[PDB]
Paper text:
Listeria monocytogenes is a well-characterized food-borne pathogen capable of placental crossing and is thus ideal for probing this barrier. Pathogenic L. monocytogenes strains contain genes for 25 known members of this protein family, which share a common overall structure that includes a secretory signal sequence at the N-terminus and a large leucine-rich repeat (LRR) domain, a motif frequently implicated in protein-protein interactions. The two best-characterized internalins, InlA and InlB, contribute to L. monocytogenes invasion of epithelial cells and hepatocytes by binding to their cognate host cell surface receptors, E-cadherin and c-Met respectively.
Residue numbers in the entry: 33 to 388
The structure:
Amino acid sequence: DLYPLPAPIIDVFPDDGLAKDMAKNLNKDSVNDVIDQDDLDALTGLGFETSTITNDSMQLLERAMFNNVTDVSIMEFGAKLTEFPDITTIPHLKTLFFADPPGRLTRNLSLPNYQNYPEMDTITMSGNNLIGSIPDFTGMPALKQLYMSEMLITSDELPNFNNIPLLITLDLSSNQLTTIPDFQNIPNLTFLDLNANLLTNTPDFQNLPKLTDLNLRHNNLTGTMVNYTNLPSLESLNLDYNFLTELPSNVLDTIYVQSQNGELPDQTINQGDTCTIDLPIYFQMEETNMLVSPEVTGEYIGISVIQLPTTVNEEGNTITVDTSALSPGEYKLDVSYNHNYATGGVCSYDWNVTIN
Ligand SMILES: [Ca+2]
Ligand SMILES: [Ca+2]
Ligand SMILES: [Ca+2]
Ligand SMILES: [Ca+2]
Ligand SMILES: [Ca+2]
Ligand SMILES: [Ca+2]
Ligand SMILES: [Ca+2]
Ligand SMILES: [Ca+2]
Ligand SMILES: [Cl-]
């Protein structure tokens, strides 16, 4: 497929948009300018920005040998470019980058099981809707970083990667994952970003001995979660904006939580009774100095919100809301703590009470 050189750029790359971008990469003023192999050899990166390039025209890159190119960056692209091709003329490619275009999920991209880029180190496709699944890569043994945030990835599209043993960073934030694999073969993984997914738990990871940062902010973790037994390198576990009533005790010293919500059990009491709750997370946060303010408040929510006297029982680790003056009926109660009026943060727990 290699076009004979020397030749005009437009003859080597017979597509208006591709030729324009190649002239810019080659620092030639015109697509009519004649290039030779030395001009190609001077390139160490290729940038693309003309949105008329399509899958078919990008394939024309196989007509030229790029002996020294290690980076491909696609900064702007149209709807007819949905894949960077697996061509044989960029043998030393190390980084592949697609920009996150303006707007939300406006472009679609597929991720081939690339075979001709054995030196690939980093792939970034964040912000683009993934077409199909992420392949269980077989041709990129040196892959170290994978940025795949905001791509509408579901758990059926994410394999338990078998052949990328050097992976260090995996960013899957802002997707629709309901489960995450108990990753078997990425033991060098140090950073796992899962914020803004739909997770309800994770496995008690069996082989992540080097993981230092695990971000689970804004998921659906509810009540209790797995109490990790084998994350010896863990430094930060972000559980902010979940629905836990208790934090995992084995890793409590790594946790970031300032806001949290939750539901406590229904109770039935008699008119004149107070109402006492368990709230393990409050006591954990209090005792490990995670609170920014000390007050614990209670209220009931009807036509208006009415505050109730609320006391913390530190010996028995319970909280009592004084419901003794309420008449019989059905009530929605709330206990809140860690109020941060400056930031909008709060930890707030709701439950229903029947008073007979
Ligand atoms: Ca000229
Ligand atoms: Ca532009
Ligand atoms: Ca070289
Ligand atoms: Ca975007
Ligand atoms: Ca999908
Ligand atoms: Ca395996
Ligand atoms: Ca106590
Ligand atoms: Ca509430
Ligand atoms: Cl030549």
